[model samples]
Target: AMSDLVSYHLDDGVATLTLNNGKVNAISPDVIIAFNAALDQAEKDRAIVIVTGQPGILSGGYDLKVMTSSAEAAINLVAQGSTLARRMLSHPFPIIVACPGHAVAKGAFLLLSADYRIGVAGPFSIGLNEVQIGMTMHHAGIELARDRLRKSAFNRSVINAEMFDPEGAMAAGFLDKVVSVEELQGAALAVAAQLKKINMNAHKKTKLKVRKGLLDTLDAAIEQDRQHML
Candidate 1:
């Protein structure tokens, strides 16, 4: 598959998607399209997915220009963005998010969608700051946070828009482990190797069964918020 914003690289059954749009690696319509193609290639390869980003950032979230463009543009971008989240959450094989550094808003949600998350120890912030930035937390995000986030940290993060350092992010459920930035790639690959031993059929079935409610909620949210999201 041809892609530019998101580059795909596969090794030993692990397919890695690296975000490279810009300094912030903002997710946009084109980026999402590239992501879809890359994910499709990963699925075809029957490989575990590892989504990473630049050395100091995974993404700063949606492209601000697209969000502020126009009513139609914003709605369409969010629709695609939220749909991507649903797909990642429900992906058959394991999805690991290796955050090299800061991950905000949708970037934080990307952590929520993955089966495992690895973040580097550094001066990085990770959280859903929709409220802090004056945007309501969308319904899909609320459901995702409810499913993956630590209960006590939930309100503080999603509602209060509190950010977390690497260790705090692990405690808050955004990351499972925090390692030195230099070790981030190796750590994620090691985790992927360990995860590769599972019975994929069983993995898929169990994942679907466990996420049935969450997926159902997202399906509803995608449709429900299609017109109301702002």
Candidate 2:
């Protein structure tokens, strides 16, 4: 059996969603299904949601199979992924992203959407490298990442999307906190625990308020980008 793309576990008012796309975990339609299901469950049961990927791999962007499939399917996959990302950003619970490994392309977008991001300190590089592939960053993805970094850092990150190494990514502010690879999980959970001590509902409300405009901005951008892609 294929490993589930999403695994959910809840405790102490926190729900953890693990994305296990096996090895390099690429985003695909099935992964989207699993992720949406996990989010649905988290919505009903948790005060906060934490998202992580299997150790040594976060995501390698969209599945290559889908990318090489029919154009219609490829477009739909991007649209769905973008929409789901927006939903996660606007979710009623605070979302934390724990990156145990590299997160590139769409995966990088997810990192940006998280209210807090924890990256592992190691050889892993994280970035949005669409430009190097002769493609533009999806509008929604660009908007999401832009919401997380300062103007100068964001500009550099966009221009250097394909060139970012592990240390470069950190210097660009693409990551909130970086810990040793061995302590990555502990650091992430610790941060989540610390946030749990605060008023979670208030935190969620504040997140929603801060990101509300960004989400709207992404919605418009997605539509515009879809047209541009056509």
Candidate 3:
């Protein structure tokens, strides 16, 4: 049942965690839990992790039905999502995101937190859409964007809710590389193959050193959102 939401596959020191929910791959609480569980196993396997999605879209965003259920539910859901992003940023192994297509709102945040992101070239939307949806951006979300995205692009996307396609996303720092749709997964694996040659301990320590401040800010922002996001 859990695998239906996020399938976990490991081979040759790489673990691919594919999001397999419905059409949009909505990040329901269950999906979030499943992703973390997969990450856990990937950590145990000492594998470089690849996070991808089903065809046509990486993910739309959080499960709107769950978010709209109640104020508390929404806050809790966003908190979990933010923590997941933090975990990815600090994971012991490299994390690669192979975004098949669209990655909006929280989905885009996943790209922000990853070590590397490869997006498919196409007419696909990618950015945070909280303001467009009439919701204020959470503190954790803003911090994550500020730490990763280009400064001007952060202002446009987080405040104006502007969306970007693949090339623009690469320019805006959401994606490290962009390739054809047919080549996305293979490209991500190729990156994994290259990354696996590095010393895992050095990668882990340097990632922590490089992202120490961002992680601390995210921790504080996560708490702030929990208390103030209602």
Candidate 1 matches the true fold with a TM-score of: 0.97
Estimated TM-score for each candidate: 0.97, 0.92, 0.98
lDDT digits (tens) for residues 64-148 of candidate 2 = 6887787778788888899888888888777888888888888887887777888887778788777777776667877887877
* Candidate 2: regions farther than 4 A off: 1-3
RMSD of each: 1.1, 1.9, 0.7
lDDT top scorer: 3
Model 1 sits at a Cα RMSD from the real structure of 1.1
Write candidate 3's Cα lDDT for 85-168 as tens digits.
999999999999999999999999899989899999988999999999899999999999998899988899899999999999
| Top-TM-score candidate index | 3
Model 3 TM-score?
0.98
CA lDDT, every model vs. true structure: 0.91, 0.79, 0.93
Cα shift from native, residue 49, model 1 (Å): 0.9
With a 3 Å backbone cut-off (N, CA, C), the pairs that clash in candidate 2 are none
**lDDT computed for candidate 3:** 0.93
Candidate 2, which ten residues in sequence have the lowest lDDT sum?
A: 159-168
Considering lDDT, which of the candidate structures 1 and 3 is the better prediction for this target? 3
